[PDB]
């Protein structure tokens, strides 16, 4: 009768929503089962199992240090055991691990199971476009939504106020109240006083913003680094928002314009990304120094990557196979500056209408 | 036959817009008359006349120093002489001088004259709402549009790339091509490679943004100063944008939602204002110190004011007479914090949906 929730991922973002979910399961005992399972890929810190470190003193010592986890958030090293007659699966693993997790879950989940994908962005390249939520559905046979917004795992964990959008299309095989998941169940599952949740249907809209915003953030960084200021940056954000809407309606049609300017996953996530982050910082240094993206990527983010560098190439490849490159001058301009040696100062002329 | 253009202004924005217009008049000799007149309220410098300082060596030494003005930008101390059968009037003076300029132009303009107001914002209070372009139309009997975007006179003058929206409803009195002004004439009049122009109809939409953005910028400052970061700020911008749309469509129902998220006057102007400026800076200090607004206004802005402080009171008064206070929780929250002594930390609970 009540909904059993499992989180598949355990990382930064994985541990953090699993806490969000565990706090709501305790908060609504008539709706959700008391215990929340979290799939942790077994690792040993100082010869001690990570799964047991979490199952008292309640801290993900490696991926989320200093954050006290509820009591009902139980770590599980077995993927199939964590899924043992689950109702709601919250997918929170890096994109490169999705094919592994899906192949391992095939024939072990359940037709009744409904899922939510916390994986930001979508699949884009020369061969086509695909939502990661749709990959889950066609490799598991389960209904799958998305969670995305202007948020960072570190801030949500420290209970710093931010928002998120949760998108889910109610399926045909729905049977209502205390039996299946609707927008009320999803609102109760994720909403916290420090984490405002808006529940919608548009899974496509929420998803494309998560990737495309990073291409726009590069254009803002270029413009900031050149010393053009806030007004020039705000102009790229406006042009960028328009290109995100255009991309969504062209390839997912399907998608509501409203999602892009009304939701956290849209406009708010674009604003925060263009204000500060990996993509804007790398682009700003490219303009300051004159070094190429990857030189700047190495210098500032050491380990990690500015995902917009990959996205602008992938979007370009998809648009070349569509014959729709002319329709997105900002996306094209960012690609031309990053990969080829386009002047950067020519950005206004390239986007000029 | 060609369009004679006059700018009523001479200040920061006035001289800058007159430079933009003079550049385009020289650029389109088949559309506009060669000379552009600029009304300058006579003042003496080195005991010298400001009007003659501009009419060679072409510099507004007091209001726009270091900026070389074309050749065809002629300063005029006589209001009526500057309007000497003129086709297009560009109003660019501070809000407090609009009743003076209008009362002095009454019975001296000409019915065929079309105008553009560069005066940001609109009139709001307990008694009602009014566009300042509508005040011009009701006092002069001339059609009047608006010019607003994410821009600063200083940057546009320096030819630093930015954008603007120009809004104008084509009237019933319209003739067509080389006889009257349409969106093509307005695009040619204001568009520059360093100043991108988008021409629309929605005069109401672009006007309300110019005032309301400062109420939102206060909410961002509060949230930043509390140490909640970019994600919390982006959330207030998202909520704020929604409240600007809601306000526009409630009180100027002929307003298009599109204007708010597609145009420079909308989303871009909101982004730049919330990123940096008087309103965000004062609000940030209010959170940092704990002093009241005006104590913070004196400490940073010296001989300048954060308009949003007045606007949040004026909007509240209008909403009280409408009985629509509940519909705008963010606008109400900003008010309550500024005027009364509302905790500021309660901002998420006040806007919670």
XYZ file of C-alpha atoms in Angstrom:
706
model
C 0.000 0.000 0.000
C 2.533 2.829 0.910
C 5.231 3.736 -1.650
C 8.698 2.181 -1.179
C 11.398 4.544 -2.575
C 14.892 3.571 -3.861
C 17.647 5.947 -5.071
C 20.138 4.539 -7.526
C 23.416 6.461 -7.284
C 24.810 7.536 -3.929
C 27.120 10.301 -5.247
C 26.962 14.006 -4.535
C 23.493 14.516 -5.955
C 22.475 10.897 -5.248
C 23.063 11.103 -1.449
C 21.504 14.541 -1.299
C 18.172 13.709 -2.789
C 18.120 10.410 -0.974
C 18.174 12.592 2.168
C 15.436 14.852 0.758
C 13.353 11.679 0.004
C 14.104 10.023 3.444
C 12.931 13.198 5.218
C 9.649 13.217 3.363
C 9.063 9.426 3.821
C 9.290 10.053 7.613
C 7.061 13.138 7.049
C 4.359 11.193 5.281
C 3.893 7.712 6.753
C 0.407 7.232 5.158
C 1.884 7.839 1.631
C 5.460 6.441 1.692
C 7.167 3.433 3.347
C 9.412 4.457 6.340
C 12.774 3.230 4.894
C 14.525 4.663 1.772
C 17.089 2.388 0.068
C 20.147 3.876 -1.680
C 22.249 1.798 -4.088
C 25.933 2.347 -3.240
C 28.624 0.837 -5.528
C 30.742 -0.920 -2.845
C 34.089 0.741 -2.006
C 36.291 0.559 1.116
C 37.744 3.646 2.881
C 40.640 2.608 5.240
C 39.459 -1.031 4.905
C 35.891 -0.143 6.030
C 32.746 -0.705 3.857
C 31.145 2.618 2.729
C 27.623 1.040 2.969
C 28.181 0.321 6.716
C 29.751 3.790 7.416
C 26.413 5.293 6.160
C 24.291 2.717 8.128
C 25.619 4.512 11.358
C 27.206 7.167 11.944
C 24.983 8.300 8.947
C 27.520 10.169 6.754
C 28.704 9.575 3.151
C 32.309 10.324 4.250
C 33.667 10.276 0.639
C 30.920 11.852 -1.550
C 29.028 14.154 0.904
C 31.229 14.887 4.015
C 29.843 16.636 7.121
C 26.187 15.981 6.170
C 24.153 14.033 8.749
C 21.738 11.609 7.024
C 18.267 10.932 8.642
C 18.000 7.364 10.158
C 15.682 5.741 7.560
C 18.221 6.285 4.716
C 19.778 2.796 4.302
C 22.775 2.163 1.983
C 22.664 -1.040 -0.140
C 25.609 -2.568 -2.118
C 23.332 -4.903 -4.181
C 21.462 -3.262 -7.117
C 18.716 -5.954 -7.290
C 18.191 -6.070 -3.433
C 17.680 -2.244 -3.305
C 14.985 -2.633 -6.032
C 13.252 -5.578 -4.113
C 9.535 -4.728 -4.738
C 10.171 -0.964 -5.036
C 7.424 1.468 -6.157
C 9.473 4.610 -7.010
C 13.038 4.594 -8.456
C 15.011 7.882 -8.322
C 17.827 7.679 -10.935
C 20.865 9.692 -9.803
C 24.075 8.308 -11.434
C 26.476 9.965 -13.989
C 25.290 9.693 -17.654
C 28.125 7.250 -18.596
C 26.796 4.708 -16.064
C 23.170 4.689 -17.261
C 23.761 1.885 -19.900
C 25.399 -0.305 -17.146
C 22.603 0.255 -14.540
C 19.851 -0.385 -17.168
C 21.478 -3.582 -18.547
C 21.852 -4.867 -14.937
C 18.230 -3.945 -14.007
C 16.670 -5.584 -17.160
C 14.226 -8.265 -15.959
C 14.613 -7.235 -12.275
C 12.433 -4.115 -11.920
C 8.600 -4.318 -12.406
C 5.964 -3.004 -14.976
C 4.184 -1.118 -12.089
C 7.377 0.764 -11.089
C 7.502 4.501 -11.910
C 10.812 6.376 -12.077
C 12.359 9.888 -11.855
C 15.652 10.799 -13.635
C 17.901 13.387 -11.909
C 20.331 13.146 -14.878
C 20.696 16.701 -16.289
C 20.556 17.202 -20.023
C 19.794 14.749 -22.812
C 21.521 12.761 -25.491
C 22.466 14.783 -28.555
C 24.743 14.043 -31.521
C 24.936 13.492 -35.307
C 22.690 10.351 -35.151
C 19.802 11.933 -33.185
C 18.294 13.337 -29.974
C 17.102 11.307 -26.997
C 15.901 11.991 -23.460
C 17.731 9.870 -20.833
C 14.302 9.333 -19.201
C 13.144 7.746 -22.545
C 16.266 5.470 -22.636
C 15.260 4.215 -19.121
C 11.655 3.598 -20.366
C 12.717 1.690 -23.419
C 15.298 -0.399 -21.600
C 13.233 -1.090 -18.483
C 9.595 -0.709 -19.644
C 8.852 1.685 -16.751
C 7.323 5.225 -16.823
C 10.070 7.832 -16.234
C 10.068 11.551 -15.467
C 12.790 14.098 -14.615
C 14.063 16.315 -11.771
C 16.060 19.465 -12.762
C 16.489 23.047 -11.540
C 18.807 25.838 -10.379
C 20.468 23.719 -7.661
C 23.832 22.234 -6.508
C 23.993 19.027 -4.332
C 26.292 20.788 -1.775
C 23.784 23.638 -1.144
C 20.633 21.399 -1.042
C 22.489 19.088 1.479
C 23.375 22.091 3.672
C 19.712 23.065 3.476
C 20.410 26.298 1.677
C 17.239 27.490 -0.017
C 16.853 26.705 -3.746
C 14.178 25.285 -6.096
C 13.658 22.377 -8.517
C 11.203 21.312 -11.211
C 9.911 17.707 -11.234
C 8.325 16.706 -14.576
C 6.249 13.542 -15.118
C 3.609 12.559 -17.686
C 0.838 10.607 -15.925
C 0.666 7.313 -17.926
C -2.250 5.330 -19.315
C -1.635 2.478 -16.921
C -2.358 4.821 -14.047
C -4.783 3.693 -11.283
C -5.175 6.607 -8.812
C -4.551 7.488 -5.107
C -2.470 5.352 -2.693
C -1.912 2.886 -5.593
C 0.040 4.898 -8.214
C 2.170 8.071 -8.479
C 0.629 11.399 -9.565
C 1.820 15.033 -9.215
C 0.599 15.173 -5.560
C 2.807 12.135 -4.608
C 5.820 13.715 -6.466
C 5.219 17.095 -4.729
C 5.116 15.339 -1.309
C 8.200 13.190 -2.208
C 10.585 16.030 -3.129
C 9.221 19.286 -1.584
C 11.099 20.610 1.479
C 10.960 24.109 3.154
C 14.602 24.626 1.934
C 13.906 22.934 -1.467
C 10.833 24.300 -3.309
C 9.319 21.834 -5.804
C 7.116 22.643 -8.834
C 5.540 19.540 -10.464
C 4.715 19.657 -14.214
C 4.209 17.269 -17.198
C 6.857 18.594 -19.672
C 9.711 16.025 -19.241
C 11.285 17.140 -22.572
C 11.453 20.900 -21.689
C 13.056 20.371 -18.214
C 15.710 18.064 -19.881
C 16.975 20.112 -22.853
C 17.616 23.210 -20.632
C 19.993 21.155 -18.430
C 22.395 20.655 -21.370
C 21.814 23.749 -23.591
C 22.290 26.277 -20.747
C 26.022 25.322 -20.675
C 26.462 26.344 -24.391
C 24.819 29.717 -23.505
C 27.051 30.068 -20.347
C 30.096 29.868 -22.688
C 28.758 32.798 -24.769
C 28.278 34.817 -21.505
C 31.842 34.068 -20.341
C 33.278 35.160 -23.726
C 31.328 38.415 -23.503
C 32.274 39.034 -19.792
C 35.993 38.211 -20.358
C 36.057 40.709 -23.274
C 34.959 43.358 -20.702
C 31.476 43.957 -22.171
C 29.760 43.691 -18.760
C 26.363 42.601 -17.395
C 24.248 44.129 -20.236
C 26.107 42.129 -22.894
C 25.863 38.961 -20.709
C 22.072 39.471 -20.128
C 21.668 39.862 -23.976
C 23.344 36.402 -24.563
C 21.080 34.896 -21.867
C 18.027 36.367 -23.680
C 19.223 35.101 -27.095
C 20.197 31.754 -25.469
C 16.771 31.304 -23.796
C 15.147 31.914 -27.227
C 17.419 29.255 -28.806
C 16.616 26.715 -26.015
C 12.835 27.279 -26.609
C 13.322 26.983 -30.427
C 15.396 23.756 -30.016
C 12.770 22.189 -27.712
C 9.788 22.968 -29.935
C 11.656 21.892 -33.117
C 12.872 18.501 -31.775
C 10.356 17.885 -28.951
C 7.129 19.531 -29.995
C 5.447 18.348 -27.491
C 7.212 20.759 -25.210
C 5.511 23.790 -23.729
C 7.136 27.267 -24.150
C 5.901 27.932 -20.548
C 8.354 25.355 -19.090
C 11.388 27.363 -20.334
C 10.430 30.740 -18.773
C 8.171 29.633 -15.816
C 10.274 26.783 -14.332
C 13.478 26.408 -12.277
C 14.803 23.933 -14.916
C 14.434 26.671 -17.554
C 15.170 30.396 -16.967
C 16.423 30.034 -13.309
C 18.914 27.285 -14.187
C 20.138 29.382 -17.162
C 20.572 32.479 -14.879
C 22.566 30.614 -12.170
C 24.799 28.835 -14.765
C 25.586 32.093 -16.595
C 26.226 33.903 -13.233
C 28.876 31.442 -11.985
C 30.168 27.961 -12.781
C 32.645 25.795 -14.766
C 31.411 26.790 -18.285
C 31.246 30.583 -17.697
C 34.657 30.552 -15.834
C 36.458 28.606 -18.672
C 34.937 30.916 -21.349
C 35.913 34.051 -19.343
C 39.578 32.854 -19.149
C 39.542 32.032 -22.937
C 38.690 35.741 -23.526
C 41.145 37.022 -20.802
C 44.197 34.935 -21.890
C 43.587 33.677 -25.450
C 44.156 30.061 -24.609
C 41.901 27.450 -25.985
C 39.120 25.874 -24.054
C 40.938 22.811 -22.817
C 44.020 24.657 -21.686
C 41.649 26.821 -19.558
C 39.667 23.680 -18.484
C 42.958 22.128 -17.154
C 44.079 25.379 -15.383
C 40.735 26.041 -13.517
C 38.765 22.824 -13.011
C 41.591 20.356 -12.862
C 39.745 17.097 -12.521
C 36.406 18.159 -13.862
C 35.028 19.223 -17.224
C 33.019 22.173 -18.613
C 30.218 20.102 -20.225
C 29.275 22.970 -22.626
C 32.500 22.243 -24.632
C 31.150 18.779 -25.538
C 27.503 20.028 -25.952
C 28.247 22.798 -28.502
C 29.966 20.221 -30.794
C 27.163 17.619 -30.343
C 24.383 20.203 -30.987
C 26.289 21.366 -34.117
C 26.600 17.755 -35.405
C 22.843 17.134 -34.862
C 21.986 20.438 -36.621
C 24.273 19.584 -39.602
C 22.400 16.244 -40.109
C 19.059 18.166 -39.806
C 20.160 21.104 -41.988
C 19.085 23.488 -39.171
C 22.464 25.192 -38.310
C 21.232 28.633 -39.567
C 18.276 28.521 -37.066
C 20.628 28.598 -34.037
C 23.290 31.362 -34.611
C 24.324 31.560 -30.886
C 24.801 27.749 -30.569
C 26.756 27.886 -33.888
C 28.832 30.948 -32.763
C 29.902 29.221 -29.466
C 30.906 26.046 -31.465
C 32.904 28.097 -34.056
C 34.816 30.031 -31.321
C 35.609 26.872 -29.219
C 36.602 24.397 -32.005
C 37.706 26.587 -34.896
C 39.456 29.948 -34.368
C 36.505 32.369 -34.690
C 37.367 35.919 -33.470
C 34.982 35.969 -30.377
C 34.615 39.798 -30.809
C 32.369 38.971 -33.847
C 29.716 37.403 -31.500
C 27.196 40.365 -31.926
C 27.512 40.176 -35.780
C 27.024 36.349 -35.704
C 23.776 36.535 -33.653
C 22.492 39.820 -35.281
C 18.849 39.551 -36.516
C 9.361 63.600 -47.643
C 12.296 62.248 -45.445
C 11.772 62.022 -41.659
C 13.115 64.897 -39.516
C 14.103 63.595 -36.029
C 14.266 65.610 -32.754
C 15.434 64.351 -29.330
C 13.973 66.125 -26.240
C 16.616 65.316 -23.592
C 20.336 66.308 -23.625
C 21.315 64.345 -20.472
C 23.053 60.946 -20.197
C 20.569 58.863 -22.107
C 19.318 61.825 -24.173
C 22.737 62.633 -25.751
C 23.483 58.900 -26.252
C 20.152 58.185 -28.025
C 20.641 61.374 -30.135
C 24.130 60.070 -31.197
C 22.533 56.674 -32.191
C 19.778 58.524 -34.189
C 22.266 60.987 -35.883
C 24.450 58.013 -36.997
C 21.397 56.331 -38.623
C 20.084 59.570 -40.264
C 23.491 59.854 -42.035
C 23.213 56.085 -42.763
C 19.711 56.339 -44.331
C 19.492 59.593 -46.422
C 16.464 58.300 -48.445
C 14.502 57.656 -45.166
C 15.614 60.362 -42.675
C 16.569 64.068 -42.944
C 20.383 64.651 -42.558
C 20.265 66.808 -39.361
C 18.990 65.686 -35.951
C 17.975 68.339 -33.445
C 18.510 67.880 -29.682
C 16.718 70.098 -27.155
C 19.260 71.245 -24.544
C 18.039 73.216 -21.481
C 20.487 76.169 -21.678
C 23.290 76.198 -19.068
C 26.633 77.995 -19.028
C 29.933 76.306 -18.406
C 33.062 78.389 -18.672
C 30.373 81.032 -18.652
C 30.066 79.376 -22.061
C 26.885 78.115 -23.716
C 26.516 74.276 -23.601
C 24.535 74.332 -26.921
C 27.544 75.951 -28.712
C 30.134 73.614 -27.036
C 28.192 70.685 -28.656
C 27.856 72.540 -32.042
C 31.741 72.103 -32.356
C 33.932 70.472 -30.793
C 30.943 67.979 -30.634
C 31.018 66.883 -26.954
C 28.411 67.159 -24.149
C 31.207 68.147 -21.706
C 28.884 68.022 -18.629
C 26.471 65.080 -19.238
C 28.477 62.748 -21.566
C 32.263 63.586 -21.356
C 34.814 62.102 -23.788
C 32.151 61.048 -26.339
C 32.587 62.487 -29.850
C 29.184 63.347 -31.390
C 28.681 62.879 -35.217
C 28.435 66.265 -37.114
C 24.717 66.276 -37.825
C 23.723 66.235 -34.182
C 22.763 69.892 -33.534
C 21.996 71.194 -30.000
C 19.026 73.589 -29.658
C 18.147 75.737 -26.578
C 14.569 76.498 -27.809
C 12.042 73.727 -27.365
C 9.748 75.006 -30.064
C 12.504 75.615 -32.570
C 13.755 72.033 -32.191
C 10.189 70.763 -32.930
C 10.001 72.994 -36.055
C 7.952 70.678 -38.161
C 9.482 67.483 -37.050
C 8.245 64.034 -37.942
C 9.678 61.880 -35.094
C 10.100 63.036 -31.451
C 12.346 60.922 -29.173
C 11.543 61.842 -25.525
C 14.537 61.272 -23.261
C 14.303 63.369 -20.066
C 13.849 62.467 -16.397
C 10.260 61.551 -15.301
C 9.888 64.725 -13.145
C 10.322 66.930 -16.283
C 7.685 65.224 -18.425
C 4.761 67.451 -17.147
C 6.884 70.608 -17.926
C 7.905 69.486 -21.472
C 4.299 68.422 -22.326
C 2.698 71.663 -21.005
C 5.197 73.644 -23.083
C 4.728 71.609 -26.214
C 0.858 71.801 -26.071
C -0.320 73.480 -29.299
C 3.209 73.455 -30.822
C 3.706 69.864 -32.033
C 1.438 68.685 -34.828
C -0.998 65.821 -35.156
C 0.975 63.847 -37.715
C 3.966 63.652 -35.396
C 4.791 60.197 -33.979
C 6.869 59.804 -30.821
C 9.085 57.360 -28.854
C 9.545 57.593 -25.049
C 12.915 56.444 -23.573
C 11.515 57.057 -20.043
C 11.831 53.809 -18.139
C 9.010 52.400 -16.100
C 5.407 53.557 -15.677
C 3.213 55.443 -13.151
C 1.841 53.246 -10.306
C 0.101 54.127 -7.014
C -3.134 53.875 -4.966
C -5.138 55.899 -7.577
C -4.174 53.813 -10.640
C -1.666 52.690 -13.290
C -0.502 54.777 -16.281
C 2.103 54.461 -19.044
C 4.192 57.622 -19.544
C 3.875 57.242 -23.304
C 0.048 57.391 -22.736
C 0.537 60.650 -20.731
C 2.413 62.085 -23.795
C -0.459 60.947 -26.120
C -3.177 62.387 -23.849
C -1.264 65.717 -23.374
C -0.029 66.147 -26.997
C -2.477 64.129 -29.162
C 0.426 62.272 -30.832
C 1.026 58.482 -31.213
C 3.741 57.369 -28.756
C 5.743 54.174 -28.338
C 8.580 53.193 -25.980
C 12.322 52.301 -26.016
C 13.636 50.088 -23.133
C 16.250 47.341 -22.695
C 19.191 45.982 -20.663
C 21.403 49.041 -21.286
C 23.244 52.016 -19.687
C 23.835 55.362 -21.537
C 27.613 55.233 -20.699
C 28.088 51.809 -22.380
C 25.903 52.555 -25.481
C 27.887 55.866 -25.943
C 31.229 53.970 -25.635
C 29.781 51.604 -28.329
C 29.927 48.618 -25.915
C 27.542 45.982 -27.312
C 24.052 45.790 -25.746
C 20.415 45.506 -26.908
C 17.111 47.387 -26.687
C 13.433 46.801 -27.430
C 11.438 49.459 -29.313
C 7.638 49.089 -28.954
C 5.072 50.964 -31.070
C 1.440 50.267 -32.005
C 0.883 51.265 -35.653
C -2.065 53.741 -35.449
C -5.351 54.067 -37.417
C -4.045 57.465 -38.736
C -1.235 55.539 -40.599
C -0.525 56.127 -44.338
C 2.414 53.859 -45.332
C 6.022 54.063 -46.692
C 8.084 57.294 -46.867
C 5.047 59.140 -45.395
C 4.581 57.597 -41.906
C 6.532 55.565 -39.313
C 6.237 51.755 -39.144
C 8.451 49.064 -37.518
C 10.912 49.175 -40.476
C 11.503 52.963 -39.954
C 11.955 52.393 -36.149
C 14.383 49.478 -36.782
C 16.431 51.676 -39.169
C 16.267 54.663 -36.724
C 17.671 52.898 -33.635
C 19.557 49.751 -34.806
C 23.385 49.941 -34.692
C 26.017 47.095 -34.881
C 26.844 47.858 -31.177
C 23.137 48.412 -30.256
C 20.806 45.584 -31.362
C 17.169 46.665 -31.791
C 14.047 44.470 -31.714
C 10.836 46.283 -32.788
C 7.475 45.078 -31.369
C 3.914 46.397 -30.701
C 3.591 45.753 -26.915
C 4.224 49.266 -25.437
C 2.648 48.182 -22.085
C 4.887 45.056 -21.606
C 8.198 46.788 -22.100
C 7.137 49.632 -19.764
C 6.064 47.636 -16.683
C 9.348 45.620 -16.670
C 11.417 48.857 -16.318
C 9.764 49.625 -12.959
C 8.974 46.101 -11.528
C 12.521 44.666 -12.057
C 13.779 46.873 -9.177
C 11.293 45.322 -6.690
C 12.612 41.874 -7.782
C 16.288 43.107 -7.557
C 15.609 43.923 -3.851
C 14.466 40.311 -3.220
C 17.708 39.063 -4.921
C 19.900 41.331 -2.770
C 18.178 40.132 0.440
C 18.773 36.520 -0.595
C 22.450 37.151 -1.673
C 23.282 39.159 1.504
C 21.885 36.282 3.635
C 24.533 34.069 1.931
C 22.065 31.888 -0.005
C 24.020 32.272 -3.285
C 23.248 32.285 -7.029
C 20.626 29.463 -6.916
C 18.480 31.361 -4.408
C 18.922 34.605 -6.433
C 17.957 32.833 -9.744
C 14.809 31.477 -7.927
C 13.710 35.080 -6.981
C 14.349 36.176 -10.601
C 12.122 33.289 -11.814
C 9.368 34.126 -9.276
C 9.820 37.853 -10.076
C 9.536 37.329 -13.866
C 6.276 35.406 -13.224
C 4.942 38.308 -11.108
C 5.894 40.902 -13.802
C 3.982 38.804 -16.440
C 0.978 38.415 -14.072
C 0.962 42.194 -13.302
C 1.170 43.152 -16.986
C -1.667 40.857 -18.125
C -3.894 41.732 -15.125
C -3.617 45.551 -15.573
C -2.777 45.838 -19.292
C -4.404 42.699 -20.679
C -3.433 43.649 -24.212
C 0.069 42.723 -23.150
C 1.747 39.683 -24.644
C 3.470 37.110 -22.349
C 6.102 36.831 -25.160
C 7.361 40.404 -24.541
C 8.466 39.535 -20.972
C 10.619 36.470 -21.836
C 11.598 37.210 -25.509
C 12.634 40.896 -25.249
C 15.562 42.928 -23.834
C 13.034 45.098 -21.927
C 11.783 41.940 -20.153
C 14.031 39.034 -19.037
C 17.406 40.662 -20.042
C 16.655 43.890 -18.121
C 15.622 41.802 -15.090
C 18.876 39.715 -15.299
C 21.210 42.765 -15.510
C 19.385 44.606 -12.666
C 19.490 41.574 -10.352
C 23.204 40.927 -11.253
C 24.412 44.415 -10.221
C 23.003 47.866 -9.465
C 21.622 50.288 -6.808
C 18.585 48.146 -5.816
C 20.464 44.799 -5.420
C 23.437 46.541 -3.613
C 21.192 48.326 -1.000
C 19.191 45.108 -0.356
C 22.458 43.100 0.027
C 23.729 45.578 2.704
C 20.307 45.455 4.516
C 20.906 41.674 4.894
C 24.683 42.085 5.711
C 24.287 44.836 8.378
C 20.639 44.870 9.528
C 20.106 48.559 9.021
C 17.058 49.835 7.311
C 16.946 50.551 3.629
C 17.543 54.274 3.742
C 20.391 53.954 6.166
C 21.890 51.564 3.528
C 20.829 53.933 0.643
C 22.863 56.810 2.222
C 25.920 54.541 2.931
C 26.387 53.343 -0.686
C 24.459 55.507 -3.206
C 25.301 58.915 -1.586
C 23.292 61.439 -3.714
C 21.289 58.691 -5.504
C 18.187 56.553 -4.772
C 17.256 52.858 -5.182
C 13.937 53.340 -6.994
C 12.644 49.870 -6.090
C 12.229 51.112 -2.463
C 9.447 53.505 -3.635
C 8.031 51.089 -6.292
C 7.391 48.216 -3.799
C 5.263 50.684 -1.723
C 3.470 52.121 -4.860
C 2.692 48.581 -6.230
C 1.388 47.545 -2.743
C -0.898 50.645 -2.605
C -2.296 49.899 -6.114
C -2.861 46.219 -5.161
C -4.647 47.212 -1.894
C -7.127 49.397 -3.895
C -7.587 46.451 -6.360
C -7.782 43.758 -3.654
C -5.026 41.809 -5.499
C -2.219 41.755 -2.819
C -2.458 37.914 -2.408
C -1.725 37.433 -6.175
C 1.797 38.925 -5.849
C 3.538 37.326 -2.775
C 7.103 38.378 -3.855
C 6.093 42.052 -4.452
C 4.279 41.924 -1.058
C 7.262 40.210 0.702
C 9.749 42.909 -0.538
C 7.383 45.618 0.726
C 6.858 44.014 4.123
C 10.659 43.612 4.651
C 11.505 47.219 3.521
C 8.693 49.191 5.281
C 7.653 46.998 8.191
C 10.147 44.746 9.953
C 9.537 41.398 8.328
C 12.280 38.813 9.145
C 13.797 38.553 5.555
C 14.767 34.882 6.295
C 10.999 34.099 5.903
C 11.169 35.024 2.144
C 10.862 31.317 0.942
C 7.789 30.752 3.225
C 6.168 34.025 1.973
C 6.503 33.078 -1.742
C 5.858 29.286 -1.202
C 3.204 27.861 -3.597
